[PDB]
Design a protein around this ligand. Structure first.
Ligand SMILES: Nc1ncnc2c1ncn2[C@@H]1O[C@H](COP(=O)(O)OP(=O)(O)OP(O)(O)=S)[C@@H](O)[C@H]1O
Lengths: 722, 359, 181
């Protein structure tokens, strides 16, 4: 037969009769001719009959095909369509042409097997459909043993070919539709080799999200897409995926497995090298496991079936929990996060490429510092984003501050309402040539000019904004000269390697020069940029960071080292007490900023002695130097230190016991409390095993939770005192 | 006095019948039988109101539409006017003449297809058979109350679904409706960024209810409709609906989805830039958690053209706990509630209006 | 990839003793990967010489055509393009043997692997029934098939075409030192 899904392309028969109905129409026509496409029909546009399908290239058969079934006899809504003589037309011809494809039921492209003697509008080779070679032959030529679960594309073999929702690689940034990147390239490449590395080849390690590890895969794909590849790796494709029409199936199972298992089969067949990394099921499965592949691919790894993993380590270890063949098939790649130092060039590179988002210009550097300075201040975040985060945020606040150009606007909010008000009241008053107030009518001189000379400011603040528009907006185009070219070299093009490099190089630098050179100067503010139409981080961050955090204003600056000196030398001024402590303390800060100090671990320091006293300001006043929320510090009681561990600070329940809020206490705090000190009862009385445990963790300024999550920001101090 | 859109795409096809030629002639009806497509609705397409004769959603066999172009005149464009001999303007009275249905007058199928057996001159052919049907394309054209008094393309000119089952969003302001309640502008004025920002632009402010859940967007829309954006709102507009298009209904299943097919393309029709939330969390969330606008939302993150605002908080965290699954790639927060006097002031401002309502 | 492999072997025990928690031989097997990993490392596209030297020769072939058109390039101007074409030719020529050196060796080495592999087919196809006390059905095709393939082997195995570049070959160890892997 044809299929269960035959509705669509099969629906157009009564649609062909749709002029008026029909006592029946005929298998000379149907919307399956057009199928879902308005030219040649899926198959005889592309799918089956595109190249080889004989007649009806685009409008060939379908253009005039409707002549047969148009209009009824008398049909208000009596009837629609029916094959009649065509009823048995494909009946055996639907199930005959299948042979053994590794398939299930009757085929519409199987019904496309033998076509028909004459049912159609066309002359090609016969009275049958299209011309020749299509359907069962074309499909068999063009494919095999694959249609759809119980059904498929309506009338016609089926336009459906690849796995429904794909997320491109090859052609993805083939257009540069994604970005250049730097990152872990070899570090990556290392993997990427090993992505081949045979027998067990995929990475099946990775640390933790957020940073472009995705974006890696692409930069991965890059040299891959650069198609300079290990031949064994040479070809490939992925779409590293999630989800589907999946919830689509109501209450059914593996709606994935539905497309998915066929997707396997999609991928199963040959298609040369095509890489099947999906993404997250690692995170998935678990409980309420869906076994997308998780049972099957492990076997269905089968012949050369290639999927290359991405995830969080503890999340990963969260399957070290599940374990199993999660051992096998599974391999080892870390991740990292770099130094801002490392980071900037990235930060550098495409921020302009980004910038165009805001169509502004960028400042240079301290940004990044200030960003890293910032990075210190919202550190839960990934490194790179942070920029991006601030960046656009900056750019935003900028764009707010700037792109919204709300300088004149607030003026022109007030000053267009300050233009015509005071006008009519300044002309008259009782004392004219007498002296009581002799400035009386001076108040109209620049008043008439208030919004009036804001028109020059409308001019200016647009003028050199178009002096800034010329600056940025010309580039963004002129950007795409060298931009597209680098992607336009795509064939090893000397048409690209000369022409648009010419069209670049003569044009670019000149027009590059022009724009800042078309920024002359300004007397009110710096240079012809009126809004200044650029970005000063410090500024840009200040509020930002504020509107991130809190009153910087000291943090309107960094010296801190002198502050080290002075706040210290002044800790008196805020303490007046045991001074030498301050030193060692501050020395520890010097240490804290030594870093020539052993990187390991924040300072130890004293037990002080007694309580309820400067100890407490002592206890407090610390970040009063530093981070100046001494709200901060965490606490413990030696009392709380039992003779077994529950202790919910850290650890607590980790494996299989009751609750995972257990032990997060500090962590999640520490997580979002990357800087503090702790408290314990004098730290003194603490339970001995704890004392180990505490010092156990207290020692080693690099650790990870008893729940298995990184400990020791180690920058952050504790010193507890007894 | 009305239409010139539905009619403009129905009886106004005389202007499309000749660029300059045949002031009164019907060599070209239905935009002169060259226009648009059979896509959403407009232009030469499958049919005018309802046409079952030829392939649906398609203008002309071989080339799409473009039929009877360049009639037998030179440039007699504004002689006076008339299609179909002298009945062209009267062709705007035939939408109810055969009247399978579209509406009384001013319809694409109304004006042009108003001729039963007549369009301009072929016999009468765009998409149709005889008359009294108004069904084949008509229903498929979302006609049958597809007519409305707001400027639009009736039965041909527009195609509106998500657009039809829908809420104003955008215009709710330019047509005055509610006023400003001043307030958290600066917040929105902050959040104003959150709109234009590259990623995570999705702005849920999960603070106060009522006015204060409401009044925000509103003023936003105000501070939108003022149209002072550097960029986007110029080319951007907005959407919020909860069971607010077609059916909250229980008919069978997938009502959400059912509503979503609009939601699906909903922006991709790419009119302006349409980005906005309808409010609610669980609605944001879905049935328990379900995909409704939800698990599919990433595609819409992939579709961009986002949504915005939230609720009162906690269930934020709740889902944010339940998952930030996108919300991790969401970005926003809010503040909660201001104080007395400045409020009293805005109330001092808000004073007259509903008082004035009472006067 | 051939390697002398001896020390490489001995690397195991070490490498073994280095992360031996993993299953010693098959972990040692892991090395065998890691080896070819380290080789595939060396490999990438190509083995490792030009894909490295792609840093120069090809980026000097970028010098060959990168600057091909800027404002003006004729005789005396700021445009430095052409001069790379004079030199890299001979260099980029050697790529071709260098290319071959693994490739044409791989070409040969293709069969090499294939050779007894297919014997391990064919002599299994000999062994097809040899274990039933079946004999000649095998020997039938197996006649000369041993002393032809193996002869080709014998022929081709002997084939070096090095200057004498490294050993008896062209690029097989590709230049790959175990120790360094
Ligand atoms: N040189 C670079 N140019 C552009 N992007 C870069 C560069 N180096 C790193 N990236 C990353 O590209 C990323 C794009 O978004 P990402 O989400 O981080 O990709 P991803 O983070 O791996 O996906 P997840 O879920 O975030 S892990 C940014 O987060 C950057 O960290």
């Amino acid at each position: 037969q044809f299929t269960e899904r035959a509705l669509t392309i099969l629906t157009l028969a009564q649609k062909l009769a749709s002029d008026h109905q029909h006592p029946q129409l005929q298998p000379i026509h149907i919307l399956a001719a057009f199928i879902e496409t308005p030219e040649d029909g899926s198959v005889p546009y592309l799918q089956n009959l595109i190249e080889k399908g004989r007649y009806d290239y685009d409008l060939f058969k379908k253009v005039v095909n409707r002549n047969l079934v148009r209009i009824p006899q008398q049909q208000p809504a009596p009837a629609e369509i029916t094959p009649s003589y065509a009823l048995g037309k494909v009946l055996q011809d639907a199930a005959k042409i299948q042979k053994q494809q590794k398939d299930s039921f009757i085929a519409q492209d199987h019904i496309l097997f033998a076509l028909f003697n004459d049912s159609s509008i066309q002359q090609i080779f016969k009275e049958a459909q299209v011309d020749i070679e299509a359907i069962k032959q074309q499909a068999l030529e063009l494919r095999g043993n694959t249609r759809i679960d119980s059904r498929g594309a309506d009338t016609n073999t089926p336009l459906e070919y690849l796995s429904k929702y794909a997320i491109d690689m090859t052609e993805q940034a083939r257009q540069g539709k994604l970005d250049p990147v730097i990152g872990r390239e070899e570090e990556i490449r290392s993997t990427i080799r090993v992505l081949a590395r045979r027998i067990k080849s995929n990475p099946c390690l990775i640390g933790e999200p957020g940073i472009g590890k995705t974006a890696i895969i692409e930069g991965v794909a890059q040299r891959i897409i650069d198609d300079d590849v290990p031949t064994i790796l040479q070809g490939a494709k992925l779409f590293s995926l999630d989800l589907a029409a999946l919830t689509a199936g109501a209450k059914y199972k593996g709606d994935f497995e539905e497309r998915f298992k066929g997707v396997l089969k999609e991928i199963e067949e040959s298609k040369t090298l095509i890489v099947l990394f999906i993404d997250e099921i690692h995170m998935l499965m678990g409980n309420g496991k869906d076994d997308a592949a998780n049972i099957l691919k492990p076997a269905l790894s089968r012949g050369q079936l290639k999927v290359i993993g991405a995830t969080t380590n503890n999340e990963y270890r969260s399957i070290v929990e599940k374990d199993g063949a999660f051992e096998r098939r599974f391999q080892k790649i870390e991740v990292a996060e770099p130094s801002v130092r490392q980071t900037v060039a990235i930060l550098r590179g495409l921020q302009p490429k980004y910038e165009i988002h805001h169509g502004v210009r960028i400042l240079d550097s301290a940004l990044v510092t200030a960003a890293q300075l910032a990075k210190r201040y919202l550190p839960y975040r990934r490194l790179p984003d942070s920029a991006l985060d601030l960046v656009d945020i900056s750019c935003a606040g900028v764009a707010v501050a700037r792109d919204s150009k709300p300088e004149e606007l607030d003026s022109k909010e007030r000053q267009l309402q300050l233009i015509q008000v005071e006008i009519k009241a300044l002309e008259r008053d009782e004392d004219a040539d007498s002296t009581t107030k002799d400035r009386l009518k001076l108040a109209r001189q620049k008043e008439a000019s208030l919004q009036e000379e804001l028109e020059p400011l409308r001019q200016r603040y647009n003028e050199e904004k178009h002096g800034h528009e010329e600056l940025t907006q010309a580039k963004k185009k002129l950007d795409e000269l060298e931009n597209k070219a680098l992607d336009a070299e795509r064939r090893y093009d000397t048409a690209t390697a000369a022409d648009l490099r010419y069209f670049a190089i003569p044009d670019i630098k000149k027009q590059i020069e022009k724009l800042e050179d078309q920024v002359a100067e300004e007397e009110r503010r710096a240079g012809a940029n009126s809004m200044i139409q650029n970005v000063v981080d410090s500024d840009t961050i200040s509020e930002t960071a504020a509107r991130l955090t809190g009153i910087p204003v000291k943090k309107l600056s960094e010296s801190e080292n002198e502050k080290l000196i002075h706040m210290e030398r002044d800790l008196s001024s805020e303490v007046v007490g045991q001074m030498d402590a301050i030193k060692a303390v501050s020395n520890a800060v010097r240490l804290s900023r030594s870093g020539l100090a052993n990187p390991r671990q924040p300072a130890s320091f004293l037990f002080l002695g007694l309580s309820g006293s400067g100890k407490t300001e002592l206890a407090k006043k610390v970040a009063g130097f530093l981070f100046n929320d001494e709200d901060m510090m965490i606490r413990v009681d030696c009392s709380e230190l039992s003779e077994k561990y529950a202790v919910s600070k850290l650890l607590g329940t980790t494996a299989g016991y009751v609750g995972y809020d257990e032990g997060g206490f500090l962590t999640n705090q520490l997580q979002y409390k990357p800087y503090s000190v702790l408290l314990f009862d004098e730290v003194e009385k603490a339970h001995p095993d704890v004392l180990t445990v505490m010092l156990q963790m207290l020692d080693d300024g690099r650790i990870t939770s008893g729940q298995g999550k990184t400990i020791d920001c180690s920058n952050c101090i504790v010193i507890m005192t007894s």
